[model samples]
Target: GLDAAAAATRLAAIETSLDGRLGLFALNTADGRTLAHRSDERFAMCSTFKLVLAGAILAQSAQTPGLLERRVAYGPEALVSYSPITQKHAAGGMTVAALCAAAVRHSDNTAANLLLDQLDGPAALTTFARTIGDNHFRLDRREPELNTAIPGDPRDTTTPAAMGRSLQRLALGRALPAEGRALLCAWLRGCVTGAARIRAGVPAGWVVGDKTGTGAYGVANDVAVLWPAAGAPPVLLAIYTARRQKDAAPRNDVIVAAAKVVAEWLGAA
Candidate 1:
């Protein structure tokens, strides 16, 4: 359902919208076919790493039914009023599922760390990532507002292509068990974080499941699975930026423009 010609034509707008330092990888999730790319090079993953964290939480849930319902508390030392986690009342505690939701749905870094702690840290999340096909995708650092962030950090990094493939498998439910997949998808779709980025690209009535990341050190990212109003094919899109530009609005505009191009090129049903 995706072709190089139409993709390029529609993506021209994204080219004009994007800075040279930014890049994206997009594909048809249903077939694992790439539709567009700028450069497949690795970039800082930032909060988007929480996606893998979300998957790991579900893997844990699969082995322990009550895991999802268990509660984790945030003491006074915890960073409660972070960006998307503005519900200050949550400092007391939140469920495993709720934490996962906050992590992905709101790009809540504090929730991400708690989830990482619950799932046994980066090693376990890396294990879950490898269960699919990403051999080099690393989750080596922490953030809690979130815990070093920059363009070329070796400890935590990813490529648009790498993230796109991972998200493709995620949206296709290839790597996760049925229930786990449902949990991940629900969170992605329920994400209230990237309304103006990946979600903005969506046409009226189209559904988008996505995650967004922003870092003070210089990175803005949005990864998504787009199910257009006229369905049949779903688009897996990842837009990554680091170093060269830090302003959130321009980077976000790239995703907004890129998404619209893909949807239009696909021409609905």
Candidate 2:
């Protein structure tokens, strides 16, 4: 089933077609094998870091069972910009699971900050990244900064390929237990941002678990899992784009088109 020649040809064509700058990494999750990689260079993750935070929290929670069920009340101080979670529920009580769900599914900034606070900030995040065998991912500060700062670190950040490695860890159940991995996967499946790009690329019946990141500067990225029908081997993908014109709508459309192209490539492969 391996078609090196055909895959190379298709990849070359896709590289030419992608608008704005783009980076991609695709792998077979079952065996820890790479299927394709193009421009998998490093880039800022924007809100995508929430997933990393979620992993850290899950890892910590495993050692301290019932942690996820613990409730924390938000106050005015918890508010951060336009985050839907903080805007509506800033004064409400929420469990750790609910906060993580809102952060991942809706890219809620305030929720992310709240979870970061619970995770005990940079030391915990760095420790978790190392525990998972990911060295490139890092937090820019000791505490979770508000969304007002830039989306990613100019120096400390990650690449699409590195992110693929992170996903591979989760899919293998090495990052957490089967149940924890399943919880993260379920949250990813509910992701709502960058819908037109990664999710829209796949067929309706194909189950895709994904997270998207977008910011002011034409920053757009998506990391996803594709479960082919008949229980075929799953494909894990990470796509990133940046440095485009300021028009947000068209730039987003470009990201979606690139994702569709990648989906077609995977399906055809």
TM-score of 1: 0.85
Q: Which ten residues in a row have the lowest lDDT in candidate 2?
A: 142-151
- Residue 195 accuracy (lDDT) in model 1: 88
Instruction: Candidate 1: list runs displaced more than 4 Å.
Output: 1-3, 9-17, 30-32, 80-92, 145-149, 243-250
Model 1, span 228-247: residue lDDT tens: 65556778888876545344
lDDT for 156 in candidate 2 is: 37
Off by over 4 Å in 2: 1-20, 30-40, 141-156, 244-250
How does each model score on TM-score? Answer: 0.85, 0.85
lDDT of 1 at 169: 76
Residue 238 of model 2 has an lDDT of: 83
lDDT scores in order: 0.73, 0.70
